[PDB]
């Protein structure tokens, strides 16, 4: 009888508040209750079931002393009750109890251990997302509690990293001197080497745990989304706290200590990166106040990039996403002086294996957008550094073809900047332009030899391969456009130590050889347009004897390829084409 089963579960819930019942019996009863919520929610009695259980669960949670040992049956029972509250469906039946549950959870956020606080935060997020209640004083008290945690963070950092404390052996430390869930072993009698052995796990206080600090900013973002008109001025107070938080760095001496904890440092960096994501969300609303504090922000996020652990690829990804969002705003101008460090690939990507394979496209696309927006302010040295990095990106066959095209397009745009800065500096701009042209010619050769041979091998006679063909076409088009731009830059730059510019000049023999190789390789590379892509999925080489090209893209790119040579001095054109014809 489902009614009898529901009454039995109600008796179990009432027995939860009972003092006589053994703890393990309560744990088993609630474990049975947790598994059977699928059956309870079907019946219309689920509403009365909620009206009975939710007040009782809240009462038991309120009455209990805050536990901090993970193996304690009372702590496990409290955690199971909280998880049961989280698992309760969020339909309209939860609405009457929502206010009481939210108030109870908000009071526990001030007071309880990491496990229970994290569960309470999840419950708060779910309830506020689904039901969206109006603003109460508990919300302002939460925002003040978060601000207090942000202010307390340097003390936490000093306590755990800067001045670690040795836990007395065979003793159970208070939770205020552990930074994370730590397991310890205790022998009951210290008088002898042989004694009864017991093991305990200590849960930190929620006000000191960095996992809670990592989880907080998303809740603030959610409540700003729900309560935008009310808490707008309160969020403004977070900005200096956010900047101070991201500015914090653990000293080098602390990391080398005998008591240094790597997982706690990972949690600390995770909290800092979550704070930077919060900043990236609020950057466009509070842009004036962020601008006032931006000078520390540049340092803070450069240091987050330097200090992000190699193993934590997800943290590096979130940091890169937040940086991409921030760089879209005016604040990218502040990075103009420091981009010489930001071009260090170790800073940007690190030495992690997953970071190197997965996140390099994200890193170079973010940096490419930054360079493209900033390019007119970068000096000649920074332009050369960006050229060197993205030139190395052109060749790199581990990167997807989209990233190679993106780097080619970046190098194309730099050419007029490199020209302007070289004319102002009277520097070596023509040399870096020649080096870019060489990198483009070598990419043409690589496409002709490796990529086109594979594409042709994959073809079959008529009557992701599409992606490989479309990206080869796009890369060849970008290479042609970049070669034309680089040629215009070379033909528009004063040479190193030259007296004066002249409106066109016969190229040196080495440059002419490079252009001869360009003709040889690009004429092979432009064969990609022969490979058609039928609607049936067949990729086939078109009939060889056909000069009536039906495609506009091939006509345009072939005319652009000829545009490279038509702007040269007649003697250079003659030397190249006598050999190449």
């Amino acid at each position: 009888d489902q009614t009898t089963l529901m009454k039995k579960y109600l008796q179990f819930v009432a027995a939860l508040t009972d003092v006589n019942t053994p703890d393990e019996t309560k744990l088993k009863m609630m474990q049975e209750v947790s598994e059977n919520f699928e059956n309870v929610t079907s019946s219309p009695q689920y509403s009365t079931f909620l009206e009975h259980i939710i007040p009782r669960f809240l009462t038991f949670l309120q009455d209990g002393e805050v536990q901090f040992l993970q193996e304690k049956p009372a702590q496990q029972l409290r955690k199971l009750v909280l998880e049961i509250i989280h698992r309760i469906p969020t339909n309209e039946h939860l609405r009457p109890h929502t206010k009481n549950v939210l108030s109870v959870m908000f009071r526990f956020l001030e007071t309880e251990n990491e496990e229970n606080v994290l569960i309470c935060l999840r419950i708060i997020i779910e309830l506020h997302k689904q039901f969206r209640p109006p603003i109460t004083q508990e919300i302002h008290h939460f925002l003040d509690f978060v601000k207090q945690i942000y202010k307390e963070l340097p003390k936490v950092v000093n306590r755990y990293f800067e001045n670690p404390q040795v836990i007395p052996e065979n003793t159970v430390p208070p939770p205020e001197m552990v930074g994370m869930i730590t397991t310890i072993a205790v022998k009951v009698n210290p008088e002898r080497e042989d004694s009864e052995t017991r093991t305990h796990s200590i849960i930190p206080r929620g006000s000191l745990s960095l996992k809670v600090l990592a989880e907080l900013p998303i809740i603030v973002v959610l409540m700003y989304q729900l309560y935008k008109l009310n808490i707008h001025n309160v969020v403004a107070e977070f900005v200096p706290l956010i900047m101070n938080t991201i500015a914090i760095q653990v000293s080098a001496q602390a990391r080398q200590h005998k008591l240094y904890n790597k997982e706690l440092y990972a949690d600390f960096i995770a909290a800092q990166i979550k704070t930077l994501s919060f900043l990236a969300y609020i950057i466009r609303i509070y842009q004036e106040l962020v601008t006032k504090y931006s000078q520390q922000m540049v340092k803070g996020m450069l240091q987050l990039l330097s200090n992000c652990p190699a193993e934590t690829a997800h943290l590096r990804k979130e940091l890169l996403i937040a940086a991409k969002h921030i760089l879209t705003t005016e604040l990218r101008n502040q990075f103009i002086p420091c981009m010489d460090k930001l071009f260090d690939e170790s800073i940007l990507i690190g030495s992690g294996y997953t970071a190197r394979e997965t996140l390099r496209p994200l890193a170079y696309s973010t940096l490419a957008d930054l360079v493209h927006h900033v390019r007119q302010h970068l000096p000649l040295s920074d332009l050369s550094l960006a050229v060197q990095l993205f030139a190395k990106n052109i060749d790199d066959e581990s990167l997807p073809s989209s990233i190679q095209t993106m780097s080619c397009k970046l190098l194309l745009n730099l050419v007029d900047c490199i020209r302007s800065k070289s004319e102002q500096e009277s520097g070596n701009g023509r040399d870096v332009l020649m080096r870019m042209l060489e990198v483009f010619v070598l990419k043409f050769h690589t496409i002709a030899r490796y990529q086109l041979s594979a594409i042709f091998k994959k073809c079959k006679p008529q009557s992701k391969q599409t992606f490989q063909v479309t990206d080869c076409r796009s890369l060849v088009k970008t290479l042609v456009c970049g070669v034309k731009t680089i040629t215009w830059g070379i033909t528009s730059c004063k040479a190193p130590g030259e007296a004066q510019f002249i409106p066109n000049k016969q190229l040196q023999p080495k440059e002419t050889q490079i252009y001869i190789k360009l003709v040889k390789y690009a004429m092979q590379a432009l064969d990609i347009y022969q490979v058609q892509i039928a609607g049936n999925g067949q990729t086939y080489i078109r009939v060889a004897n056909c000069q009536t090209v039906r495609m506009k893209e091939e006509k345009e790119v072939l005319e652009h390829f000829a545009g490279v040579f038509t702007m040269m001095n007649p003697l250079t054109f003659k030397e190249i084409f006598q050999t190449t014809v």
Binding site: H86, E126, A266, D267, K317, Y353, T354, S384, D395, D396
Partner: protein
């Protein structure tokens, strides 16, 4: 000269010795890694590698100089080293004999050179050892290449014995770089998949080599919070292969399955998918109540979790991929499947992938 005469350099031993000296030298690798963009010598490492490769093509016994060529892959030079990769992945498996492949492996084992770090050994396993051994196993030369199927790990001729004892030595494991560990787990996956008989004979009452290989994988099952996900899941992929090949106890299989179910992170999606594709068919084939265990754990994770979307979508992707396996337990899963389908399809702001 090498281009015009392919056979000339194979005899000039002193010249090639000084070419190697330059190639392994610190100043050369620093200068070419830390060039100015306008540096004239950008072709130099390609030309030097081409010469050293030409020497190595005819003199197979000089495995040391072959390994030093992988310094081309540790940097990121601005000249295309694809000809080295092509040679190492294609020509070595095709051309080298079984004895020469064994020499490659045994030189990799005893390579005690202070200047040859873990990343270079990772390059060795990635480009030389694994392709060659994969080609040999595909051709069927596994018995000759591995040598004797020594159940007792002492025999210095048994490739599996020396690999598990010397290479996987627990004392080495501490400072292990993640790339080296990953490619060692890939080599162990080759050994297990192609040559299970050499790893463990089911007739033997006990074998230490299987235990020591599982022990090498096992740190991935530890619940540490700062591990590169590819290393952890590569270890799960090795355990998935071992579980498929060998009659492993239930608790290990269930722990590996549960840990792969909790693996909803984006960073290691492909490796987790490979491991699950291997393991999910294996679970019903392994134990007498495999279908019930599949049901129990899938239901448990879908219910007790899934308040976070990525976990639920991960489990649903796994169900979709292996629906044929889940077919005999369809009736249990289908309710949660349709509920999650409705929720994911109608919750606000559905991404097209969801």
């Amino acid at each position: 000269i090498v281009k015009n005469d392919d056979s000339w350099l194979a005899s000039q031993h002193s010249l090639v010795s000084q070419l190697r000296r330059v190639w392994v030298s610190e100043n050369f690798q620093e200068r070419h890694r830390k060039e100015n963009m306008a540096a004239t010598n950008w072709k130099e490492p390609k030309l030097l590698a081409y010469c050293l490769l030409n020497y190595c093509k005819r003199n197979y016994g000089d495995i040391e100089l072959l390994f030093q060529l992988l310094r081309a892959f540790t940097g990121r030079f601005l000249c295309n080293m694809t000809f080295l990769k092509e040679y190492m992945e294609e020509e070595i498996p095709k051309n080298y004999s079984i004895a020469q492949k064994r020499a490659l492996f045994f030189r990799f084992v005893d390579f005690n050179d202070p200047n040859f770090g873990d990343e270079l050994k990772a390059k060795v396993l990635q480009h030389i050892l694994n392709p060659a051994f994969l080609y040999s196993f595909e051709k069927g030369e596994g018995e000759q290449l591995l040598g004797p199927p020594n159940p007792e790990g002492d025999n210095p001729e048994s490739i599996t014995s020396v690999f598990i004892t010397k290479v996987l030595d627990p004392e080495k494991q501490a400072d292990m770089l993640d790339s080296l560990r990953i490619y060692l787990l890939q080599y162990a996956t080759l050994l297990v998949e192609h040559a299970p008989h050499h790893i463990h004979d089911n007739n033997k009452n006990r074998n230490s080599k299987l235990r020591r290989l599982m022990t090498f994988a096992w740190p991935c099952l530890l619940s540490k919070a700062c591990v590169d996900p590819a290393c952890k899941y590569s270890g799960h992929l090795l355990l998935a292969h071992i579980i498929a090949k060998f009659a492993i106890h239930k608790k290990i299989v269930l722990q590996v399955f549960h840990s792969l179910l909790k693996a909803h992170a984006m960073e290691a999606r492909a490796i987790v998918r490979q491991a699950m594709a291997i393991l999910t068919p294996a679970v019903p084939a392994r134990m007498e109540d495999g279908h019930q265990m599949l049901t129990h754990w899938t239901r448990k994770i879908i219910v007790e979790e899934g308040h976070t979307v990525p976990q639920l979508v991960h489990i649903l992707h796994l169900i979709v991929q292996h629906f044929k396996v889940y077919y005999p337990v369809r009736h249990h899963l289908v309710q949660h499947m349709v509920s999650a389908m409705q929720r994911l399809g109608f919750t606000p702001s559905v991404t097209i992938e969801q």
